[PDB]
């Protein structure tokens, strides 16, 4: 005769109870800089609707602008 069994799980979550005040940050999407002073609402790339600074974007016509990755060359 013979037999054998096994099995186990590992749970790991944030830890802190359900209550995270200000659990959101605003950092560039190309340089991940501190966009604190800057405005993320307006600093949104119309291309990929992402968050970038006034340094990782390019000025375009029709008062539009896109991120280097967008306005710049193609990227896989
Ligand atoms: Zn973009
Ligand atoms: Zn940037």
From Swiss-Prot:
The stretches annotated as zinc fingers (FYVE-type) lie at 28-70
What functional role does this protein have?
A: Modulates exocytosis of dense-core granules and secretion of hormones in the pancreas and the pituitary. Interacts with vesicles containing negatively charged phospholipids in a Ca(2+)-independent manner.
User: Which locations, inside or outside the cell, does it occupy?
Assistant: Membrane; Cell membrane; Cytoplasmic vesicle, Secretory vesicle membrane
Oligomer status and interactors: Part of a ternary complex containing STX1A and RAB27A. Can bind both dominant negative and dominant active mutants of RAB27A. Binds STXBP1, RAB3A, RAB8A and RAB27B. Interacts with MYO5A.
Spell out the protein name for this chain: Synaptotagmin-like protein 4
* Origin: domain of life: Eukaryota
């Amino acid at each position: 005769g013979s037999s054998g069994s096994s099995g186990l799980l590992e749970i790991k979550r944030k830890g802190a109870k359900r209550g995270s005040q200000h659990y959101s940050d605003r950092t560039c999407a190309r340089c991940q800089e501190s966009l604190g002073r800057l405005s993320p609402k307006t600093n949104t790339c119309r291309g990929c609707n992402h968050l970038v600074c006034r340094d990782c974007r390019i000025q375009e016509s029709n008062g539009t602008w896109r991120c280097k990755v967008c306005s710049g060359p193609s990227s896989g």
